[PDB]
Amino acid sequence: NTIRVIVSVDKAKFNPHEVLGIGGHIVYQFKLIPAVVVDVPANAVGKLKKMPGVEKVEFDHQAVLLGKPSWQPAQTIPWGIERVKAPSVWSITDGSVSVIQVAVLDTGVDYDHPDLAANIAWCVSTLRGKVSTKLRDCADQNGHGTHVIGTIAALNNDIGVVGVAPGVQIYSVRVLDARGSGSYSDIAIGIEQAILGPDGVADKDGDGIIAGDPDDDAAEVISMSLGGPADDSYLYDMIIQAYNAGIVIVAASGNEGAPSPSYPAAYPEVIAVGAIDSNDNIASFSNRQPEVSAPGVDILSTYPDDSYETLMGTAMATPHVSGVVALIQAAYYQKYGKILPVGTFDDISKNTVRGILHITADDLGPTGWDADYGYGVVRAALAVQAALG
Ligand SMILES: [Ca+2]
Ligand SMILES: [Ca+2]
Ligand SMILES: [Ca+2]
Ligand SMILES: [Ca+2]
Ligand SMILES: [Ca+2]
Ligand SMILES: [Ca+2]
Ligand SMILES: [Ca+2]
Numbered sequence: 001n002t003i004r005v006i007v008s009v010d011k012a013k014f015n016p017h018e019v020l021g022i023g024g025h026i027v028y029q030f031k032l033i034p035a036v037v038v039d040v041p042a043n044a045v046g047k048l049k050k051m052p053g054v055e056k057v058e059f060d061h062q063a064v065l066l067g068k069p070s071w072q073p074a075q076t077i078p079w080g081i082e083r084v085k086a087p088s089v090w091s092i093t094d095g096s097v098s099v100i101q102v103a104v105l106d107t108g109v110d111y112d113h114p115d116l117a118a119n120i121a122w123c124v125s126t127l128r129g130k131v132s133t134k135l136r137d138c139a140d141q142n143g144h145g146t147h148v149i150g151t152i153a154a155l156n157n158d159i160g161v162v163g164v165a166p167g168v169q170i171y172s173v174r175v176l177d178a179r180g181s182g183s184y185s186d187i188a189i190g191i192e193q194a195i196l197g198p199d200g201v202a203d204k205d206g207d208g209i210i211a212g213d214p215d216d217d218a219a220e221v222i223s224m225s226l227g228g229p230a231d232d233s234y235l236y237d238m239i240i241q242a243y244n245a246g247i248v249i250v251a252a253s254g255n256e257g258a259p260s261p262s263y264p265a266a267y268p269e270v271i272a273v274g275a276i277d278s279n280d281n282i283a284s285f286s287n288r289q290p291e292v293s294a295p296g297v298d299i300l301s302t303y304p305d306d307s308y309e310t311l312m313g314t315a316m317a318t319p320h321v322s323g324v325v326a327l328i329q330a331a332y333y334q335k336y337g338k339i340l341p342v343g344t345f346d347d348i349s350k351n352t353v354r355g356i357l358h359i360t361a362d363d364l365g366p367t368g369w370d371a372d373y374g375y376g377v378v379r380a381a382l383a384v385q386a387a388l389g
Helices: 015-020 041-049 079-083 144-153 183-198 233-244 314-336 353-360 381-387
Strands: 002-009 026-027 035-041 054-059 062-065 099-104 120-125 169-174 180-184 221-224 247-250 268-275 292-295 299-303 307-312
Touching: 002 041, 002 183, 015 026, 026 054, 026 099, 026 183, 026 247, 035 041, 041 054, 054 233, 079 292, 079 314, 079 353, 099 144, 099 183, 099 268, 099 314, 144 169, 144 221, 144 307, 144 314, 169 183, 180 183, 183 233, 221 314, 221 381, 233 247, 247 314, 268 314, 292 314, 314 353, 353 381
Parallel strands: 099 169, 099 221, 120 169, 221 247, 247 268, 268 292
Antiparallel strands: 002 035, 002 054, 026 035, 062 180, 299 307
16 A cells, blocks of 8 residues: 655755665656656555655645536537627737647546647646556546536637637546545646656757747647645645746636635646636636636546536636637737747736736726635737737
8 A cells, every 4th residue: 555755856865766665666857847647555654754865745635627618510609708808809910829738737638629629739647646648548538627627728619619719639647546636646747747748858959948849849828727735845836847847837726615725727827717707797606816717617528538518616617718828929920920028926017928818808896806706807809919019
């Protein structure tokens, strides 16, 4: 009965052979942070902590999906896509700018869904600490991933639905199992994979440009429709690698009606996303103090197997924002041959992605940022306009 823990280490002194020596093993060595996921006897963690080079031993917490199913063959435009004013942007860009990819860390994807396939660029899985690019492993066993993905990127054609950014390339990174449950360790490995991309190297040409570099295959957005209450240092360390790579990170605020967002949404470097309904009210389940809000009730999208389904949750709101991000970056790159900086929470200018989102958002409720809606409901068209402005 080994348990899985995540060790933060000093690479000069940590000796993995010591871990094998007490009956453990290394499951995954992070490429971008100094840490290793290890399996070891519970009764032997006492020892691990004492080994040379072991700075911290964190247990493997759990996060869960933040969407649930709610209780025409020709294409429907789901109401939320219209709410966030995406279709008007498509004349400028549908997100099909070659350097732009959106990584969706979720339950996997129905990679061959006729309304998604053309936009699935890379389908990968990190479950149990093993990185697999086998399609069987990257397929969705829950449906939630396929639905989230569809809200970002379902194709604009004569069937099904249509995403916020219906031409954007998607990386499906499976970090959640069939029940929508995920280990923090897998989720961290998944954020790492979104950075590394298909070629396995963060900055291949070593110019210090990752996101926005056409010579690399890093994602530009990481979208996490999932959350947990634990705040673990190695996971935050990974979020910072991604942020430092120029990648915009977006995550669901959570659904317990709690006064603040779950993790990773609650990190400063992450855009926490709250849920509204078709009446512009905040849903009661929506965790407070989000950064922005978006449609998250009665959301129709793609679902396995080659089907459609209506779900609800902050998980559903999240992809609407990620899709807006993808339109911003795509239109800005299309015009300027570069992307914009990610920005911070406080940001109120047009020179960062986050500043654009905050200043163009539809400010419902009490004037300015407020604990229900954040800065407001994201608006694609106005955002792209500020971007190109
Ligand atoms: Ca890219
Ligand atoms: Ca469609
Ligand atoms: Ca790469
Ligand atoms: Ca580079
Ligand atoms: Ca380059
Ligand atoms: Ca299918
Ligand atoms: Ca407000």
